[PDB]
Amino acid sequence: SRANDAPIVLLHGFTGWGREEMFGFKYWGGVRGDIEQWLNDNGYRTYTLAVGPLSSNWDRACEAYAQLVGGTVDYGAAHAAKHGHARFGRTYLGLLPELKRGGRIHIIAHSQGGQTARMLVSLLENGSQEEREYAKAHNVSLSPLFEGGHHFVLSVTTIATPHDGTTLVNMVDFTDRFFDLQKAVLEAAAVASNVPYTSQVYDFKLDQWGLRRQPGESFDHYFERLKRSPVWTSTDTARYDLSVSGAEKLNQWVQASPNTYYLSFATERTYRGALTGNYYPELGMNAFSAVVCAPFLGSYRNPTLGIDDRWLENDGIVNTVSMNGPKRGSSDRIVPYDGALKKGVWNDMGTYNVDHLEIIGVDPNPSFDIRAFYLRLAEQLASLQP
Ligand SMILES: [Ca+2]
Ligand SMILES: [Cl-]
Ligand SMILES: [Cl-]
Ligand SMILES: [Zn+2]
Structure with a gap:
């Protein structure tokens, strides 16, 4: 039963774009449809x-x-x-x-x-x-965001989130592979990386760095510029926060509010090798992840970083163990879902056999009822006691 009227707000990861971008191909729904529309249409x-x-x-x-x-x-x-x-x-x-x-x-x-x-x-x-x-x-103005005492988020639900980072960042050649992953996402949207689009298509929103794709500049050429820019080479980046080291630093200060419900969903799309103890991508994993990312994720160990066999299960982009909530550098509590959602802790909603891109519909997976998944989640969120 509904116990609140809080609005739902969708928020993408290290790819993602607004509803009118990408010729209307939705990040939240991809080839499957339009998740925001499903939710709205269902109240x-x-x-x-x-x-x-x-x-x-x-x-x-x-x-x-x-x-x-x-x-x-x-x-x-x-x-x-x-x-x-x-x-x-x-x-x-x-x-x-x-x-x-x-x-x-x-x-x-x-x-x-x-x-x-x-x-x-x-x-x-x-x-x-x-x-x-x-x-x-310095006698300068301060955003109200930095004051404290604003409380408008009742719940945060995270789906395939690298709370403790992803070891993908440690790949040799991560730079080229990572932008090749971006290109593969463009292509899923029927957007080519060698075409001189004059419309914006996919705005990387890098105003603060003075970076913007020129009209007529291909994403190939643009991404070569980005690789060399501070949004790739600085510590003030997705890249830094995505790494096991950077995620741990973030965890040291970004704690669970006692006034917010946290829900976590994990993803895996791998099988384990009986001889190696490595993990390997399943049939049906999006091709780019399967070929370029998963083999590394399911085999890379690093005793110095505490990366052991528990890190190898993955959804093609993020280690599954990272996803149930922040643990490295964190004092947050994580509790297995028990039928009653709790404030101030991570309600661990378990692990779904769906890959990083399938879970938002960008890659197909016809046995995953993506509409039912999001509608059930919305029903749970509506049930939350203020
Ligand atoms: Ca698939
Ligand atoms: Cl690292
Ligand atoms: Cl499908
Ligand atoms: Zn910044």
Whole structure:
């Protein structure tokens, strides 16, 4: 039974784009349909955020904040000075300006979106001590995001999120493979990487770095520029936060709010070798992951980083063990779902045999009833006791 009226807000990972981008091919639904529309049509009011796919979780949280409540993105004077990018970004009207006036939301997040969502909650509730102190010392303005005492997120649900990072980042040649993964996602959308699109198609939203694809510039050529830019080479990046080391650093400060329900869903699409104890991609895994990513994920061990056999099961992009909630560098509690959802802890909703891209419908999987999955989740979220 419904116990709240909080709106659902969808949040993508290290790829992802707005509803009018990609010629309307949805990140949330892909070849399967339009998840936001399914939810809305079934009485679960649902919106979609679109933030910088390659940007740091911090940047993306600041962007999400302004997209939701309205205003001009403010990355924080101290943060901007530290990393050498613009303090201020784009300007929004604001999807839900009544979030400053008592509304609440459920965030459903895929992949790296789960990090971003946790970070938004932390900043909303606690602010940033560093930004507060910087603003004083330098007599400059402070975003309300960094004040603390804002509480508008009732729940965060994470789906295939690298809470403890993914070992994919440690691959030799991760740089080229990672942008080749982006190209494979474009291609799933029937977008070519060697075509000189004059329309925007897929805006990487890198205003703060001064980066933008030129009209007529192919994604091939653009991605070569990005590889060489600070959104690939700095520590203020998705790349850094995605790594086992970076995720652990994030976990050291981004904690579970006692006022928020956290739900985690994991994914795996592998079988174990009886002789090697390695894991191997199943029939039906999206081809790019199967060929380029999964073999590494299911075989890479690293005693120095605490990467052992428990890390090898994977969904083609992220180690499954990473997904049930933050553990490395974290004091968050994780509890197996027992039929009653709890505040302030990770409600571990278990592991689904679906790959990183299947679970959002970008890769097909006709035995996965993706509509039923999201509708059941929306029904659970609606049941949450304020
Ligand atoms: Ca498939
Ligand atoms: Cl690392
Ligand atoms: Cl399908
Ligand atoms: Zn930044």
